[PDB]
Design an enzyme around this catalytic site. Structure first.
Site, PDB file in Angstrom:
ATOM      1  N   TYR A   1     -12.061  -8.036  40.958  1.00 21.53           N
ATOM      2  CA  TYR A   1     -11.249  -8.669  39.911  1.00 21.53           C
ATOM      3  C   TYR A   1     -11.282  -7.795  38.669  1.00 21.53           C
ATOM      4  O   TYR A   1     -12.251  -7.061  38.459  1.00 21.53           O
ATOM      5  CB  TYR A   1     -11.765 -10.061  39.571  1.00 21.53           C
ATOM      6  CG  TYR A   1     -11.369 -11.148  40.558  1.00 21.53           C
ATOM      7  CD1 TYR A   1     -11.350 -10.909  41.929  1.00 21.53           C
ATOM      8  CD2 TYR A   1     -11.039 -12.413  40.115  1.00 21.53           C
ATOM      9  CE1 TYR A   1     -11.009 -11.915  42.828  1.00 21.53           C
ATOM     10  CE2 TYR A   1     -10.705 -13.424  40.997  1.00 21.53           C
ATOM     11  CZ  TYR A   1     -10.694 -13.174  42.351  1.00 21.53           C
ATOM     12  OH  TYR A   1     -10.347 -14.196  43.215  1.00 21.53           O
TER      13      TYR A   1
ATOM     14  N   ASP B   1     -19.197 -18.615  44.060  1.00 22.50           N
ATOM     15  CA  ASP B   1     -18.231 -19.535  43.432  1.00 22.50           C
ATOM     16  C   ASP B   1     -18.848 -20.936  43.390  1.00 22.50           C
ATOM     17  O   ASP B   1     -19.811 -21.215  44.109  1.00 22.50           O
ATOM     18  CB  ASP B   1     -16.929 -19.662  44.240  1.00 22.50           C
ATOM     19  CG  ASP B   1     -16.121 -18.374  44.317  1.00 22.50           C
ATOM     20  OD1 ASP B   1     -16.427 -17.395  43.608  1.00 22.50           O
ATOM     21  OD2 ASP B   1     -15.149 -18.359  45.100  1.00 22.50           O
TER      22      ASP B   1
ATOM     23  N   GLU C   1      -3.407 -15.920  42.875  1.00 17.89           N
ATOM     24  CA  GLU C   1      -3.762 -15.580  41.502  1.00 17.89           C
ATOM     25  C   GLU C   1      -2.656 -14.698  40.928  1.00 17.89           C
ATOM     26  O   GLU C   1      -2.316 -13.644  41.496  1.00 17.89           O
ATOM     27  CB  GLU C   1      -5.129 -14.887  41.471  1.00 17.89           C
ATOM     28  CG  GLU C   1      -6.292 -15.825  41.867  1.00 17.89           C
ATOM     29  CD  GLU C   1      -7.506 -15.077  42.382  1.00 17.89           C
ATOM     30  OE1 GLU C   1      -8.638 -15.634  42.354  1.00 17.89           O
ATOM     31  OE2 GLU C   1      -7.336 -13.922  42.822  1.00 17.89           O
TER      32      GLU C   1
END
Length: 658
Positions: A615, A232, A503
């Site tokens: 994800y 990230d 999220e």
């Protein structure tokens, strides 16, 4: 060339097959290629598919093996005790197990090249490792080799690493076949790649997939193109997009939706060893986590993503500063000039850089690409490139001038080191994207930006309303537009979590009724409901029947257009596991029209419970198939960092799921 050995339909049922007499006297010279088509839908924890060994007493560490783990990892061992060599090369998350309930035929190609002293492994058309050594060990040069074995390695006369699976085809060649020749070997893949190493993005890594079906039938995908390994931000990351006009069968070469040029676009093989894997590009600006929506009214496609200034990520972003100054209900981007200790500038109307200390405008302006102009003239900075030539990460100037951007480390004027949200739009359904614009702050002057929920925004079916979910400490913060994304307002919804990565993705159950599914810290996916098109939100409930880890994983969700078992249906995509990011599922829920409750009736296993799934993105394709673009690896595990070509796309039909 022709194989020196070729065999097939070997069943590996926890009992090795001896092929010594067929193979050993065919092996010659120091370079070899193994091509193997195999299935393993119920593998043991650790099993060898192929072995060449010295089976004699006292030589238990003299063998070559191709092995796999029930995690999906593939590897080889090349060992010779007399030579003092014990090579072990592998990569996690390299295999498929099952697709649509059927065992997948994986195609493995291992090349042992004495000339280049290199061992290279491909699985399913993807290079998973390539390692060069100083002292090369030919796989059949191991001292005293006397056994060739399928489904085990014979050590001291006993079966080690017993396999369960099948080898449908195996060929060996007395040559190291070229990369070109490898690419000609037919595959039986259950998946395809949209973004991949060596494509137009030149990123070696991808994370955070999205999918969205446009009204024309074009399917659009966005992604983090990540350059500095899979890390990230802080890093170098751009947002890339690709589309399909044929229901997902083929995809366009990627273009960028959002990009910075302070650092070069480099395809780098990021180190995976324990001493260097946390190397991180530390001076580059980046984008991260994108989300897409289509606006019916204007026809525009809108893409948002988080924006990070040079060296900034979630970890070090100033949480107490929006990066904007409020002056009369208006918000202006703050700037710090070279040499100042505070931010004494703002960006005003028409990009005019303005001095706050003396209320003077300056001779500087910011253009539409957030680039610095002096008296109308473009300023520049020198670009950086990265390398590990010195044995550690180096970031250094490369001689190339690029436009000076306020998000850059080398810029004359710099933004506040915190996170922002930007939007861009396309008027041609993803063939090109406009220059991005920063969204205003929504939670005041002294609060950092909220974090975009990756995936899709929501276009309400019965109005012009557009919603993008975001999250921050203690709430979901929905961003709402009724004018085609020109202006936004927030709608806050408290959640009983402090500092969660909440999220969230939304589905419209029926006109004006939105259910949002979101990641928590409780091991359960949560949800909340609005019945007034996002103006107000219910308390939080939890889904039973799906498990996530304590830290949680992004969940994607759509409302299916067709009835299932006579009912309205929602489909969720998520790992289903309390242990890690694995056991991917599509879960089909049927809506109870009495009360909008959802009965999660069908669970479809995307691949083995033990294989990686993180994800994900899901969309209903125009032909009513389901497209799934997902991270096929454990993106939390510190053992699975920096893997290439693990974001993959599959096509499913409803009958597959039920």
């Amino acid at each position: 060339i022709s194989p020196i050995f070729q065999g097939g339909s070997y069943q590996l049922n926890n009992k090795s097959i001896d092929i010594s007499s067929l193979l050993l006297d065919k092996l010659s010279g120091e370079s070899q290629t193994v091509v193997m088509k195999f299935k393993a839908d119920k593998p043991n924890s650790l099993q060898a598919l192929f072995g060449l060994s010295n089976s004699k007493a006292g030589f238990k560490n003299n063998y070559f093996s191709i092995f796999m783990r029930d995690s999906g990892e593939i590897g080889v061992e090349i060992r010779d005790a007399q030579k003092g060599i014990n090579y072990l090369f592998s990569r996690p998350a390299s295999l498929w197990g099952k697709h649509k309930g059927q065992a997948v035929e994986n195609t493995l190609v291992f090349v042992s090249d004495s000339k280049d002293k290199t061992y290279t492994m491909y699985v399913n058309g993807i290079e998973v490792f390539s390692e060069t050594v100083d002292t090369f060990l030919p796989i059949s040069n191991i001292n005293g080799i006397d056994k060739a074995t399928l489904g085990a390695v014979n050590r001291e006369g006993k079966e080690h690493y017993l396999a369960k699976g099948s080898i449908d085809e195996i060929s060996l060649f007395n040559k190291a076949i070229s990369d070109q020749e490898v690419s000609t070997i037919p595959l039986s893949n259950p998946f395809q790649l949209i973004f991949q190493s060596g494509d137009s993005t030149q990123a070696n890594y991808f994370r955070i997939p999205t999918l969205y079906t446009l009204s024309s039938g074009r399917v659009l995908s966005s992604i983090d193109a990540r350059y500095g390994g899979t890390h990230d931000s802080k890093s170098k990351i751009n947002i890339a997009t690709s589309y399909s006009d044929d229901n997902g069968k083929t995809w366009s070469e990627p273009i960028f939706a959002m990009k910075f040029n302070d650092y070069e676009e480099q395809l780098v093989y990021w180190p995976r060893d324990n001493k260097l894997k946390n190397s991180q590009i530390s001076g580059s600006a980046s984008f991260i986590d994108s989300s897409i929506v289509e606006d019916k009214k204007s026809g525009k496609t809108i893409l948002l993503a988080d924006v990070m200034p040079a060296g900034i990520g979630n970890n070090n972003a100033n949480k107490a500063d929006s990066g904007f100054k409020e002056i009369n209900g208006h918000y202006y981007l703050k700037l710090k000039k070279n040499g100042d200790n505070d931010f004494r500038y703002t960006v005003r109307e028409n990009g005019v850089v303005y001095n706050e200390t003396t209320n003077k405008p300056t001779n500087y302006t910011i253009n539409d690409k957030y680039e610095v102009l002096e008296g109308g003239k473009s300023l520049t900075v020198e670009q950086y490139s990265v390398d590990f030539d010195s044995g550690s990460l180096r970031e250094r100037h490369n001689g190339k001038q690029v436009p000076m951007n306020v998000f850059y480390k080398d810029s004359l004027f710099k933004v506040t080191p915190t996170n922002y949200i930007a939007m861009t739009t396309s008027q041609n359904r993803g063939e090109s994207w406009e220059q991005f614009k920063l969204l205003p702050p929504f939670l005041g002057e002294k609060h950092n930006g909220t974090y975009l929920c990756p995936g899709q925004g929501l276009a309400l079916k019965s109005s012009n309303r557009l919603i993008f979910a975001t999250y921050t400490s203690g709430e979901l913060t929905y961003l709402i537009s009724d004018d085609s994304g020109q202006t936004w307002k927030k709608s806050s919804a408290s959640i009983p979590f402090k500092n969660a990565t909440a999220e969230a993705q939304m589905v419209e159950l029926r006109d004006g009724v939105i259910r949002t599914f979101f990641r928590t810290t409780t091991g359960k996916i949560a949800y909340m409901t609005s019945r007034d098109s996002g103006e107000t939100w219910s308390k939080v409930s939890y889904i039973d029947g799906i498990q996530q880890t304590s830290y949680g994983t992004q969940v994607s969700a759509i409302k299916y257009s067709q009835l299932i078992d006579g009912k309205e249906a929602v489909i969720l995509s998520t790992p289903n596991s309390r242990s890690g990011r694995k056991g991917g599922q599509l879960v089909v829920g049927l809506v109870n029209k009495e009360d909008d409750s959802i009965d999660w009736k069908y669970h479809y296993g995307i691949d083995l419970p033990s294989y990686g799934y993180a994800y994900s993105a899901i969309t209903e394709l125009p032909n009513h198939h389901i497209g799934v673009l997902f991270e096929k690896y454990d993106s939390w595990s510190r053992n699975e960092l920096h893997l290439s070509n693990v974001v993959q796309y599959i096509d499913l039909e409803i009958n597959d799921l039920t």
